[PDB]
């Protein structure tokens, strides 16, 4: 087995990805060619891609093909391709393996211009759109917006041309549900690639200064339950301290991190003082607990503290607050885990171990002593204990590190690591146990690497050097090892590393090119032929690479300043190693200050890009196959190994005053200069930008531009003021001068506010470096948006401070709901394609609180469609068994009418093209001849007998009436003859209790008929059967006495079905009742009984059917019992179809489609007819629910408002504000399917 190959490939193919497949062969000397091909699965017919590769000593018999799966070449449709054949073909070998494929190709980074938005805002939003290759994807993208209730609100589409998809601004609806909204992004047609972002909608006003609350520990232990100590600091959004603030502390019990509201204490509620930006506080938790808790001891509290702080600037008007719920009281507060450790051993090589200590609510503790105890085995299970070892954790990294000089012959190690903090006993000093295992070569053939796991990221463009040491009984054979460098899903470098005459091998001396960032994985492998049997030997290591951009893009203000003045014109420079696009945006730091723990949207970009990597762990493996699988590869080889041993386990180890502006995109032709004016606001603006090119993304460093002023006035205006009340609004002048000066304030306002202060002042002086309270008891008269201004005049200065006050009405913002289902076909009953909604006015409307009206619309989708259809045997079902005696003619033509009806689904006449068409004119002929035949079976009195002189039968009359209901589209029977038939039936055989007892024929017919009941309530069958036929004829002979006979028959059949007669009678009765009052309470009870009697397969039912009468006996051929089964199931089907219960029907259709009990029923005309009727009805129902509904909505006297093209592809248009005070009329074109339309009204009462 000297001649051997390895083909190595990603564990999973990404659709549309360019995948690099590498091949090595051994024991060959004649140069030869191979082809590596990606082929359809299982049939291998279509070839997606193919690569010819040539192998020779000129290539050291190594090569690669670049192969790709362009997404349109897949068949697509509802069933996407799960699997594809990878193939290799040569003169010497042919093999193929079933690769999995994935449609997850690339990255959709949603960036919203803020994380928080008020109502009455539009979001700016854009999406960065990148391939798996990290190039700008240039693909159509779609956004979907979900409210905090999980209700879809809007969808919008845009076409990428750049990698930067600047979607239209989303106007927040006129009445949003407050809370966490979500944006999802998808490539429209052909990828999963689902991006996500979150944003919060709330009534808020920007904080005027940050409060930062800084406990010394996220946990309280024995050392700090006696006394816990905490720092608080406060700083403006210009980076200067709060000079003085009054502080009120609050403490409380807590029992959950997630969601509890346990009681606050009423002790240590310390009113205290913050100076020079800082307050220092201490809580004696022991005494507070013992005083006011029911707890008295820490051992009762593996639980949490709540802490909150509020503060008010001691010489001003602004106030702020925050909290830190969840400081963990815990007896064992630490936890431990590995980081970057393999758990695989190279013997004799110093084996490194690293551990991270973490907390509950984990941070890097960094300060813990830890110690290690270990036991080993080398050979024949000689259990050998190691000497213990000790490290501190690193204070910054958290890492405690160890290295074990294990025996040169060690086979396994298992060990414990425990916290050695002398203050914690081992019941408290957190501890863990772990096992590592050797590579388990059969050939004792190994390939170790001289890698210490250098903790420090490799810098881009350095040469990595790794010496590599195969060790083997057969090293003389091992001419070269082969190496692969993989990044993310993809092999990016491959090569060969020759043995020197030193009996050692060329190291991997390679540049870490930019494509390797942030992480790459090195796998080295060889095949050694052994004595006769080949073995693939491999090892791999994760290589951490410096995070660096390919563009090296940099951005800076060219007129650099520590702080700029408001409105200052500035110049900005963008410089790059190559021509690039760049997006820019600016956002105020108070915005992020709004939300505790807010995230910068371009955070984690590299760690998110790393989620693309298919591997897990830091390297190594229990085996060659395990090494490749953990490396994220798979391989085809004859060298006695296969990756089918392993599976994709969930491996998860650890390794003007705007809010926003400058929201733009620009080209930078290697360099660009911009000139622009700053806003009038005072803050740190954070200016952030993202470079994009065919070289990929870069995120630039955030330029924090300060805008500042030494003397100014500010006002703590709340988000809205309730109309008609007066409130003392508070604020303060600030002096950051060395000296005090006199100031004066002369507030002015639009007449929408008139207030008794009537803003010659006190002309107070602020002290130097101090603030002075300013207050106004403004009393708003008029609702809405009103300009208020705080003009100020002062010694050596003036200031202007325009504002818009929002005034909101008194009372309660109550909401009310109304809506309907649009049903332009009457699937549920009354055709309902118009509705009207007057502008109704509540009797408790407050006189000025004009009612807000909002519209919403939903499409209702078909769901699962099960393509149950006839075989080509429809030819036979038409050409049916020879016409003749026993009314073989009747039994032949009776299916013809129903096959006709079935094809009058239309599809099957529109398309038979898999097979030669049924000739439509042949069908029409056959139908006509059928009508001619069926006339021959009418009795003179319009009863029916199969024999011309035979006994008249109500049974056959009802059958005829059913048939004659169908035919009328081509051949109506004269209504008089139908009326005569019905009249004769009802007038002779209506009865006082039960009905339609068969008149004069006790002799059954087998293939035309079906099993009667036992005499007990056998009338149920007759009543049901006759009812069915009558209802199918009733639309062509309405007669009030017949209606009365229906009502009677239904009453009797119901009253006789209440005792749950044997299930066939129940099923046929339920089918009869589904023709009647579909909402009759007892009908619905009988349906519930039918549903309880169903049989199913699978917990979610895949198949559903009914058995009775020991039909669980075997039947390999159709028979009376299989007939009973097929008919009773077809009746349950038709019942549920009349309830339109598609979701319940589906597993019935599937079970029918199987034809289990093969051949069907007894091949009666009954079972076959009723089955094909049910299948026809289903086929109809699917097209009925198919959504196409062009809604139009207009006011009554005022004009049209809006139109919705509600369609399967666009099933949900945005909600619309119903602005105008007129009656609203909504309607639709006839179209198809179902919708629901709502209007809701908000009124302040």
């Amino acid at each position: 087995q000297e001649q051997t190959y390895v083909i190595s490939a990603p564990k999973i193919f990404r659709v549309g990805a360019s995948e690099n497949i590498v091949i090595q062969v051994y024991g060959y000397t004649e140069a030869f060619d191979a082809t590596i091909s990606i082929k359809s699965y299982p049939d291998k017919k279509f070839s997606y891609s193919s690569g010819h590769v040539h192998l020779s000593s000129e290539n050291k018999f190594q090569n690669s093909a670049i192969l790709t799966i362009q997404p349109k070449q897949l068949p697509g449709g509802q069933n996407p391709v799960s699997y594809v054949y990878l193939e290799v073909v040569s003169k010497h070998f042919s093999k193929s393996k079933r690769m999995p494929i994935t449609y997850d190709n690339g990255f959709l980074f949603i960036h919203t211009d803020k994380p928080v938005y008020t109502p009455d805002q539009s979001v700016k939003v854009r999406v960065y759109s990148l391939n798996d290759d990290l190039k700008p994807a240039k693909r159509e993208t779609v956004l979907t917006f979900i409210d905090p209730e999980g209700s879809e609100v809007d969808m919008v589409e845009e076409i990428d041309h750049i990698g930067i998809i600047s979607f239209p601004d989303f106007k927040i609806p006129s009445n949003p549900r407050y809370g966490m909204w979500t944006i999802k992004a998808k490539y429209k047609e052909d990828f999963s690639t689902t991006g996500t972002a979150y944003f919060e909608v709330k009534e808020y006003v920007l904080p005027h200064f940050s409060v930062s609350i800084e406990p010394e520990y996220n946990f309280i232990g024995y050392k700090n339950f006696k006394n816990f100590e905490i720092t608080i600091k406060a700083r403006y959004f210009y980076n200067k301290v709060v000079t003085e603030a009054d502080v009120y502390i609050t403490f409380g019990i807590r029992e959950d991190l997630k969601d509890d509201q346990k009681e606050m204490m009423q002790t240590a509620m310390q009113n205290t003082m913050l100076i020079n930006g800082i307050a220092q506080v201490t809580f004696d938790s022991e005494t507070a607990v013992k005083e006011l808790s029911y707890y008295s001891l820490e051992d009762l509290n593996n639980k949490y503290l709540y802490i909150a702080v509020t503060v008010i600037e001691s010489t001003g008007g602004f106030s702020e607050e925050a909290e830190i719920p969840g400081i963990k009281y815990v007896l064992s507060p630490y936890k431990l885990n590995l980081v970057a450790t393999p758990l695989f051993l190279k013997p004799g090589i110093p084996y490194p171990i690293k551990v991270q200590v973490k907390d509950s609510l984990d941070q890097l503790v960094g300060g813990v002593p830890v110690t290690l105890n270990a036991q080993t085995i080398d050979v024949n299970q000689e259990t050998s204990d190691l000497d213990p070892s000790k490290s501190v954790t690193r204070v910054d990294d958290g890492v405690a590190s160890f290295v074990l000089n294990l025996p040169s012959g060690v086979t396994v190690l298992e060990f414990n690591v425990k916290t050695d903090a002398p203050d914690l006993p081992e019941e408290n000093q957190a501890r863990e146990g772990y096992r590592a295992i050797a590579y388990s070569s059969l050939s004792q053939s190994y390939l170790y690497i001289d890698w210490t796991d250098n903790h420090k990221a490799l810098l881009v463009g350095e040469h990595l050097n790794i010496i590599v040491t195969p060790k083997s009984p057969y090293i003389d054979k091992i001419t070269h090892y082969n190496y692969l460098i993989l990044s993310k899903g993809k092999i990016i470098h491959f090569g060969t590393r020759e043995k020197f005459s030193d009996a050692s091998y060329q190291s991997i001396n390679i540049p870490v090119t930019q494509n390797m960032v942030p992480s790459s994985r090195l796998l080295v492998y060889y095949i050694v032929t052994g004595e006769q049997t080949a073995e693939l030997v491999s090892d791999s290591v994760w290589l951490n690479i410096e995070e660096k951009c390919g563009n090296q893009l940099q951005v800076h203000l060219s007129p650099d300043a520590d702080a700029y003045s408001p409105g200052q014109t500035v110049s900005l420079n963008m410089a790059t190693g190559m021509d690039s696009w760049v997006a820019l945006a600016a956002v105020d730091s108070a915005v992020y200050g709004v939300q505790r723990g807010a995230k910068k949207p371009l955070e984690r970009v590299f760690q998110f890009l790393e989620k693309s990597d298919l591997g897990c762990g830091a390297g190594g493996g229990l085996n060659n196959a395990n090494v490749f699988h953990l490396a994220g590869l798979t391989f085809l080889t004859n060298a006695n190994a296969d990756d089918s041993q392993e599976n994709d386990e969930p491996c998860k180890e650890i390794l003007y005053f705007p809010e926003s502006w400058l929201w733009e995109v620009h080209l930078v032709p290697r360099r660009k200069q911009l000139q622009f004016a700053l806003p009038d606001s005072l803050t740190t603006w954070e200016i952030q930008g993202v470079g994009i090119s065919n070289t990929g993304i870069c995120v630039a460093d955030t330029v924090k531009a300060k805008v500042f002023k030494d003397v100014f006035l500010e006002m703590n205006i709340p988000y809205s003021v309730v109309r008609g009340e007066q409130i003392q609004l508070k604020g303060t002048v600030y002096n950051y001068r060395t000296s005090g000066m006199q100031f004066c304030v002369k507030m002015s306002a639009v007449e929408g506010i008139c207030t008794s202060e009537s803003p010659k002042c006190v002309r107070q002086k602020v002290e130097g470096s101090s603030s002075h309270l300013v207050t106004f008891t403004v009393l708003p008269l008029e609702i809405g948006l009103h300009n208020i201004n705080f003009s100020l005049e002062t010694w050596f200065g003036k200031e202007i401070l325009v504002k818009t006050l929002r005034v909101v009405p008194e009372g309660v913002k109550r909401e009310s709901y109304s809506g309907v289902t649009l049903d332009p076909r009457g699937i549920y009953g009354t055709i309902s394609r118009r509705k009207e909604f007057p502008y109704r006015i509540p009797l408790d409307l407050v006189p000025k609180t004009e009612i807000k009206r909002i519209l919403s619309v939903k499409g209702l989708l078909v769901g699962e469609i099960l393509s149950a259809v006839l075989s080509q045997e429809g030819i036979n079902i038409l050409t049916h068994l020879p016409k003749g005696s026993a009314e073989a003619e009747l039994m032949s033509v009776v299916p013809v009418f129903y096959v006709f009806h079935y094809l009058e689904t239309g599809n099957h006449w529109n398309i038979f093209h898999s097979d030669p068409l049924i000739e439509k004119q042949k069908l029409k002929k056959k139908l006509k001849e059928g009508m001619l035949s069926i006339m021959s079976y009418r009795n003179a009195d319009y009863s029916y007998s199969v024999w011309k002189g035979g006994s008249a039968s109500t049974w056959l009359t009802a059958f005829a009436l059913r048939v004659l209901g169908q035919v009328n589209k081509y051949v109506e029977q004269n209504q008089n003859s139908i009326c005569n038939s019905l009249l004769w039936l009802v007038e002779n055989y209506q009865l006082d209790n039960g009905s339609f007892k068969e008149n004069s024929q006790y002799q059954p017919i087998k293939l035309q008929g079906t099993l009667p009941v036992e005499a007990r309530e056998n009338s149920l069958y007759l009543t049901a059967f006759t009812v069915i036929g009558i209802r199918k004829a009733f639309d062509i002979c309405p007669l009030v006495k017949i209606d009365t006979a229906l009502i009677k028959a239904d009453n009797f059949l119901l009253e006789n079905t209440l005792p749950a007669q044997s299930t066939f009678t129940l099923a046929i009765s339920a089918y009869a009742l589904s023709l009647g009052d579909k909402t009759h309470p007892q009908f619905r009870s009988i349906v519930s009984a039918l549903k309880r009697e169903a049989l199913v397969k699978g917990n979610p039912p895949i198949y559903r059917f009914w058995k009775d009468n020991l039909q669980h006996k075997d039947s390999s051929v159709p028979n009376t019992g299989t007939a009973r089964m097929v008919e009773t199931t077809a009746y349950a089907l038709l019942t549920s179809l009349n309830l339109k219960d598609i979701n319940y029907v589906n597993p019935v259709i599937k079970w029918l489609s199987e034809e289990q009990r093969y051949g069907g029923g007894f091949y009666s005309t009954q079972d076959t007819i009723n089955a094909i009727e049910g299948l026809t009805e289903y086929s109809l129902l699917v097209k009925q629910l198919r959504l196409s509904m062009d809604i139009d909505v207009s006011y009554k006297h005022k004009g049209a408002l809006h139109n919705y093209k509600m369609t399967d592809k666009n099933f949900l248009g945005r909600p619309v504000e119903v602005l105008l005070n007129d009656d609203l009329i909504v309607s639709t074109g006839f179209g198809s399917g179902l919708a629901t339309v709502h209007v809701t009204t908000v009124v302040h009462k």
Partner: peptide, 27 residues
């Protein structure tokens, strides 16, 4: 210009005294 590159800003304005809706640039 006969065409406007994406993200570059045009300017459109009518003569004095006319009233005009919509933005001064379209993208």
């Amino acid at each position: 210009k006969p065409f406007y590159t994406v993200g570059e800003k045009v300017t459109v304005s009518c003569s004095g005294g006319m009233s005009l809706e919509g933005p001064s640039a379209f993208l």
